[PDB]
Amino acid sequence: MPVLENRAAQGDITAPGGARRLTGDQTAALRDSLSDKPAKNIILLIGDGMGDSEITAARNYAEGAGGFFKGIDALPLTGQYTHYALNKKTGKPDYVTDSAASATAWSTGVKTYNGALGVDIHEKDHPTILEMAKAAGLATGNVSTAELQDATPAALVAHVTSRKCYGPSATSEKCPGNALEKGGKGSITEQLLNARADVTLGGGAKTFAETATAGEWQGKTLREQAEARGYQLVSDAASLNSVTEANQQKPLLGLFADGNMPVRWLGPKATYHGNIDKPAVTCTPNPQRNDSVPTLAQMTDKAIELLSKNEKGFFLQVEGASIDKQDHAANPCGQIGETVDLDEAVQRALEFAKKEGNTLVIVTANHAHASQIVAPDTKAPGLTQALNTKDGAVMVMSYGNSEEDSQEHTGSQLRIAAYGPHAANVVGLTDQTDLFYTMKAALGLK
Amino acid sequence: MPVLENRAAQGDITAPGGARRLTGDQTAALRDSLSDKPAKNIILLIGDGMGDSEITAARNYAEGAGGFFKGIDALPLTGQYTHYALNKKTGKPDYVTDSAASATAWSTGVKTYNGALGVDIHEKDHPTILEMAKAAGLATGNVSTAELQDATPAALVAHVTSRKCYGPSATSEKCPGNALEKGGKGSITEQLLNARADVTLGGGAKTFAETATAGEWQGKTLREQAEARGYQLVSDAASLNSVTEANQQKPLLGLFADGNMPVRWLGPKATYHGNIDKPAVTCTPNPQRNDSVPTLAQMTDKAIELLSKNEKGFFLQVEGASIDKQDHAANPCGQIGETVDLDEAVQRALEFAKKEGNTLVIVTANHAHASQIVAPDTKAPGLTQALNTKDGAVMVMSYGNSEEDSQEHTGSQLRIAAYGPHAANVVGLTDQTDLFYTMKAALGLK
Ligand SMILES: [Zn+2]
Ligand SMILES: [Zn+2]
């Protein structure tokens, strides 16, 4: 079906029609974008905290205001979805969700309280789209630049009452009803190991150093357990490139960092009146992102390679995580760099989807975040920074929603876009739980 | 073509699938929404500052988080468009536009500098979609809750170098090259009178009290000039309801307020730590919005009545103005009340469009604004307020982008939605200038 090849400003920004992104009437192109046929595969790309503001800021900096992101902006069907959480005590809406509650909403189809993973407000477990895809015989992949125990990758495989229950120790004190030695299903990491997705790639190697408190692998570290269970462990780009097959008999687990994988671009933090008092910043590539550390695009590509060998089809979730993290850290360059990172992964996904013809690609965010693009002369109360964009002009970014350093999430609805079979279901206003039902129905899961 | 009848959460928010807004696959409904046939009429509804955040806040308060705005959310084709302005000196992007530069972009199709009305960075005039529609023989209407000299209604009829040139005196000092007594075309109000749209309704009666400095009506007030030129002047709801015809021979000019028309709901201003220190607010209806002052919905309805009698078709622009104004004023209730106001007008427009079958209805904003929905416990540096929503839960709103009281506009891309012929052209990423070309081509204007 047609991908948007170029929606950059067609000419001279200062002349009549020069800033147009369209060259003609779109009715025919959109008609050719609509198909209700079954989706053989689904690739879901999540930008953590990548609301419309974050996409505009990153486009302005990296591609220029009249620029176009060949991945993110190329998806033809667009809509806006809501992502509120629930108050555990009252069952009433809680308008600003955290990563755990939003993640659970699109992976299980039920709203929950902030902090829950894979359970509803009554702490009852609900099956995730990954578990269901596995059950139906599809290949499954879970890729992230964050720790694999963080909310978005974890929600596909774990069901715990608190996102904080990363490994055995944390689970024993914070999630005692889930603690393995108290008869529960285990921590996020133990449940991840039990879930056995075919490809799992990300950081968070640190928690695999913990020893299981109970069960068959009591006393062994979760890394030893993974090896003993038949997992192919990979810890750098060379080893990852050597993997020829990844399947239920030999599942791939790539741990490329102790915590979160390295950020792509470095820059200073935004400061009080940073746009008034400090020079404009040009982001610099991070020397430590390294030739041995696979990029999000490389991990997506390897995952698509391995997963596409399953004739039944696959489900792959890819997360550009440190957008959110750096947005909390009020660091424009880190944030924008990770949106650029995600765009590359979305490009790889779109390329495959174009030629394969039966893949639904969906790009969206879990919740909106704090950054706002403000006028150059803004005298703001929070943190600000002036950035030198691709256009050679200054763009100021403001983070003004918290005094407690981390700039919070916000409740605004945001863009969801798709390409492929059943993509129509993201157009107009939808809710994050509708995404679960769209993916389930597209894939023919029951 | 189908309007979205109900995309409210279909059930119990706490149960599986209970928060879904979709009941089935949307491919067929979207296919029936696509038509490239000519649009006989266009109704453009602009929410001043109504970015996605403002729509989410207003929906949460008035309809509840799982609620649905029968007007605003009922439009089936949705996209996101960019709205950057230009720096007059360099011609480079200026990422945060003001009302004048955004208004000029969709009404003429050329980007301009902040503060310009109907002229490009070289101060050259470009014809507006209204002027072009008149020229082609279509009926034209310009409705707003703001002063008719404010940027959005003014941009359809005036071409001046500064939005501040409301009437003769202001134009003489701020726009001397436009000043009538210096051989220019006149002020915003004089040019509005010369432009002679069939229906013009809004506030701003104050500037009509000024006397023309030169020309045929030198020494008469602009009100006297309007009467003398054949304009039917109306100043309240009863008189407006009495108008049976409005046309070029007897154009309607309704001046319902000296400045901006009254706000719908009252509430206190957001304050530093207002969510921590003060009780939650319930907005109250404004006693002064009055039974003699027509609502935006009433003015839209009367305008559609009068304008639809022109067998050629019509162009109508309707502006819900005080969303922006109250957003600058950090007043949640004023802001949300005006989004509710606009929703009613969008409903009237959609009703007509449904039965008429050849009308393109477009709902969007000029730029994004400051309000963010944050967590109840937020310790924010700006202004905050806790609101009691339709759900019986608290929602906190933050305005943290300026210390100089007025909370600024922001550069984020925002929702644009449409229904009717050529509505496909708003889906995906577009630019505000594309809206001019979409309207022109839909209407068959040359
Ligand atoms: Zn976050
Ligand atoms: Zn404004």
Curated annotation (Swiss-Prot), chains A, B:
Its cofactor is Mg(2+); Zn(2+). Disulfide bonds join 165-175, 283-333. Pfam families: Alk_phosphatase (PF00245). It is found in: Periplasm. Zn(2+) 1 binds at residues 324, 328, 409. It catalyses: a phosphate monoester + H2O = an alcohol + phosphate. GO terms for molecular function: alkaline phosphatase activity; hydrogenase (acceptor) activity; magnesium ion binding; oxidoreductase activity, acting on phosphorus or arsenic in donors; phosphoprotein phosphatase activity; zinc ion binding. Mg(2+) binds at residues 48, 150, 152, 319. Its main location: periplasm. Zn(2+) 2 binds at residues 48, 366-367. Keywords: Disulfide bond, Hydrolase, Magnesium, Metal-binding, Periplasm, Phosphoprotein, Signal, Zinc. Binds 1 Mg(2+) ion. GO terms for biological process: protein dephosphorylation. InterPro entries: Alkaline_phosphatase, Alkaline_phosphatase_AS, Alkaline_phosphatase_core_sf. The active site is at 99 (phosphoserine intermediate). Its EC number is 3.1.3.1. GO terms for cellular component: outer membrane-bounded periplasmic space; periplasmic space. Belongs to the alkaline phosphatase family. Isozymes 1 and 3 are a dimer of identical chains, isozyme 2 is a dimer of heterogeneous chains, one of each of the subunits from isozymes 1 and 3. This is Alkaline phosphatase. It comes from Escherichia coli (strain K12).
